[PDB]
Design a protein around this nucleic acid. Sequence first.
RNA 1: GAGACUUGGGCAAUGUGACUGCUGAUCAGCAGUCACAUUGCCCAAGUCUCUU
Length: 49
Amino acid sequence: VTATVNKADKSKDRTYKTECPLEFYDALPRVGEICYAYEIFLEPQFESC
RNA sequence: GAGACUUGGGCAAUGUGACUGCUGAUCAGCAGUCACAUUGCCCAAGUCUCUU
């Protein structure tokens, strides 16, 4: 904060890293190990023509 | 005690000369701070338009 001259280029933007969630962090099955198949459902809400 | 004189004492009134501080009013000269105003350098920041 003592660097009060920080108003010169306050429009500067920086980069950041990204990371997948813990569950998605290497959930790949191993041969011989238990696997969880999570079913996907697509229920229609709109009434069709 | 009074009248007057002599000296002295007491009180009072008023004036005169000098001193030490205290303020009052006016005037000049000087410094500093704060604020406003003029435009510009000016980046931040949002909106908007063009467009990047």
